[PDB]
Design a protein around this nucleic acid. Sequence first.
RNA 1: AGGACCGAACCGACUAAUGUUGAAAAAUUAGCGGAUGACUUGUGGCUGGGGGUGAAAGGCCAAUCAAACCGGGAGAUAGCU
RNA 2: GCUCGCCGGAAGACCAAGGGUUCCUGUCCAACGUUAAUCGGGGCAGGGUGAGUCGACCCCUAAGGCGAGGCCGAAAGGCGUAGUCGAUGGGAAACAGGUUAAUAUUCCUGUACUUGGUGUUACUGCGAAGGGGGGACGGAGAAGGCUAUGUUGGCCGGGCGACGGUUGUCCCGGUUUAAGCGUGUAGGCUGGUUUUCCAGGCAAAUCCGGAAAAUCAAGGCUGAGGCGUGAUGACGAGGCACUACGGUGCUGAAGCAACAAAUGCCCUGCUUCCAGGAAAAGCCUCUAAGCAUCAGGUAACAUCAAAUCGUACCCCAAACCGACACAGGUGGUCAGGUAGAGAAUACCAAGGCGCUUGAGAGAACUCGGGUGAAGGAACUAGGCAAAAUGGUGCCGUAACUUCGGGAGAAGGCACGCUGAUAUGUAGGUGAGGUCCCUCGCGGAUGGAGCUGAAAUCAGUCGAAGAUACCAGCUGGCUGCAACUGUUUAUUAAAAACACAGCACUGUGCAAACACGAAAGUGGACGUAUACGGUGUGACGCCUGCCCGGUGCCGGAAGGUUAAUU
RNA 3: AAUUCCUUGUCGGGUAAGUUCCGACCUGCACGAAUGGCGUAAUGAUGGCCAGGCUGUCUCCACCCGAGACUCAGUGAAAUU
Lengths: 271, 46
Amino acid sequence: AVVKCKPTSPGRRHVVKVVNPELHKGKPFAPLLEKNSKSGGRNNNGRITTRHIGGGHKQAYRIVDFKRNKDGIPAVVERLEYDPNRSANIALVLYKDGERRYILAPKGLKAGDQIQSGVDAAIKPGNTLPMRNIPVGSTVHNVEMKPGKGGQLARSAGTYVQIVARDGAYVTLRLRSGEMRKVEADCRATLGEVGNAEHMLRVLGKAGAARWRGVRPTVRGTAMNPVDHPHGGGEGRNFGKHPVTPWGVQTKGKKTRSNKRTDKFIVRRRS
Amino acid sequence: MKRTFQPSVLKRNRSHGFRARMATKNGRQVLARRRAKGRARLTVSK
RNA sequence: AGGACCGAACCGACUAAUGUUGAAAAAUUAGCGGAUGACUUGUGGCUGGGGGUGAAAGGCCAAUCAAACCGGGAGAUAGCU
RNA sequence: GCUCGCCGGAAGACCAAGGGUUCCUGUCCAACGUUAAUCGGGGCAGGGUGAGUCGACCCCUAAGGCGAGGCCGAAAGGCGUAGUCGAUGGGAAACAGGUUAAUAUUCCUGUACUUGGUGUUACUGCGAAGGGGGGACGGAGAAGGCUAUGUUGGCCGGGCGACGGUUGUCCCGGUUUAAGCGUGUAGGCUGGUUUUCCAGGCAAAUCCGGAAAAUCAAGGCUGAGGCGUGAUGACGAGGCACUACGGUGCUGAAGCAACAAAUGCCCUGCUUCCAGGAAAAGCCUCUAAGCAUCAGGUAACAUCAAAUCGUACCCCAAACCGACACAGGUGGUCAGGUAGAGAAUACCAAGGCGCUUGAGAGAACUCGGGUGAAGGAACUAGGCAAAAUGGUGCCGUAACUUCGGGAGAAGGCACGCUGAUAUGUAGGUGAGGUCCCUCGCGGAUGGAGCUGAAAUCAGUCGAAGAUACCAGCUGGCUGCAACUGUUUAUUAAAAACACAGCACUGUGCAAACACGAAAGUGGACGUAUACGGUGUGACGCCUGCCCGGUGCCGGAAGGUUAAUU
RNA sequence: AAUUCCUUGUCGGGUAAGUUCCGACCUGCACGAAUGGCGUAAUGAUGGCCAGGCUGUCUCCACCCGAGACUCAGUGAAAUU
């Protein structure tokens, strides 16, 4: 649900928050935890390579089973949990043998549901099967680029992928960006979609909220001196040149894709 | 008003200590120059 | 509940007077702003000079910055005093 | 030595960092001390730092550093695996009293505790560079139960007043005691025991996880304080002999109760919220390869061992950083009385100081302050500076508005002391007695004693009762930026920079992009509801016409055009 | 008008008297719609203007309490020439 705070003071007038009472309120599963130290956007040379990164709240990493190769064993979900490392939620799953793992939470999954993976598995949300056995025209998420490598597509809060058609050992898919990509017809996928669509309805409402996420302020560039940025300075506000980034690239429509290694699985890039 | 020099023994040894100088090729040349000049105190070790 | 309210410790520096071979190579006295947060502080670590860092003034990098300090080319060149 | 003045959330007391004999005693006065100097942190000589329990070393690891082979690079060299280093964090054990001119939880007296080696005896499944448990963790808020500590009464010793009164409801002082061991309370968390079975924990497992039955609800764990012992002890106000009047032996009464109460303890607890809150070892368990009349394991007793280095003194300052015996700067711990909401402010206790040139005079002028006839901004670029407002309770309060605000809007009234209601009220605390009981640190009843607001009525003193310190001036019109924030250390704090929100554009993952001759690393252990760049800048109503020029994105016939041949 | 040279534009309000301030007019030297246009409650050690209270800011200065200046003893500088 979406709730808007009352205007008891400035900085809370425009705040809108998303609250989910179904999430578990307690400590997470200790055996599946790891440390994760901040970097500040600096590489092993000590120099800044990505700007506007620094600070924030301390976080711990949760191991998530993207591969999902446990086949032929039914499992039952226990509870949903809040993950600070990603926009989507996660679910704790207990297997029949007695092993526990973490998976991404689909849209219609709740406590007490049953899920399974493998070629024999049924066509129900939360089930993982090779795309060869998936009927065409269905919606899936968490797709693998190569067999056995792990999912790398449609992992965001409310993203999904639709299978268009298949001809041989390959399948055609439509991505959220609109691109039509061709992938091998042996990769795995999960039925349904990631359920957190309300994630995009939140509004921070104040500067401090951004700092909690570890985002530093941005300086425009037209407010600097010539020695710093191409946009330079001037007596007032002049800006008499074409828009450009630091280091001198147009960044107003110029394309930058120069891979050419594959250049064969792309058909309808976008637009 | 706070001034530039704030002493600290641990930091002094780690920056200009005898072992720090010997750990790098350029540092070893500093010792050679001072030895040739006949300095009585080679480093800040003591 | 709150980058909420009044106000000490703590962190800042808007006005006036004194001082200007000063007690002080930037302070003192009477008022002044924030004070649960984009807050403040101890110890150790990382980024090196056409480079670093910068909520952006050409600011800061050991009382030195529109290109730091030390040694060397070096007795640079000076139609000028 | 007797008076006077100043600090007292320090200008008192104990440390870390840093310094390195400045510490104690004798002796000297050239130089050093902004003056003299018999004095000194000055010159010279001698003396002083005592640990199985405090700290370091030592065991374990974070950021990060180095790095056998290895990968990469004209040389120098760069990155990194197995490993090895690195506290600001985790890991066994001691308290009180006495003593030196100078050290002590280190010496002495009394009473305790921890970890290892060896031997004896009894009973025995032992074994890890492997598995599991544990260690192990955020912000804010709300109570209840306690202690440190303070006040009063009782008790014990002493006192009868330099000037009117003072044998009583009078005056002064004291009334202190640890670790350890035994007991397991206020309160917090969790349902126990037995049997059978199993695709999981890299092999194994009696351990952890999972499944199905049976049988009971009392099982276990954690836990401040109090009480007993420690203690026929130690300490103890004042007396009495030594006493170079610097100081030592001996002796030594009372040593209880009530009330108030922390920011400290129970609490790594409980409730609640979104930004979702280190690692490894010690420690407790499970087995593998092995070894099994051996070797090892558990308990009792005896005995031995616990090395080495630091320990003086200053430490908000005359000893550290500022060239100085310099109105400067510097992290942690302890927290008495009266008034008070208070760690503000005023006066004081314990304790410590009067700041290393003095003596006279009482001109102009400069500096820091007090008061003022009549007028009241006529001053000046400008109300600069100064004056003024200032507390608690009750009554009362406009335009406008995003309905939260504006608002402490503006403005008005009451405040001391004594007596009565009530020889101290409402409230809080709570003994004896009585009763109950799983008889214990228990429940119910019961009310003595102690402590103690506010209000009403009457009377009374002064010019003045929020009397001192302390402690908002208020209202009307208008430009700019929404707001809290940030900036030229040392002439500019703003209308400048950030900001939530909005739009365009790039990027399908070995992502765009950035640092690197390269290897590689960041982006990210992320995946288009994601990430980078650019402009605008909350919110409300809106954002018109122009593609000739320059840039960017597409197209393709024809013309022109490099190396090469 | 943070934009208007001519300019103290013209009319009205406030004052005994207003080159500033507030409200209208349009002849906009040389405003204009995301290098955004026009409005806006609250907020500000921000710019301009007007009132009440209050005063040595002033007409116009007078007296008093302290530290220097002056005299005696000890120590004993500086720029310049």
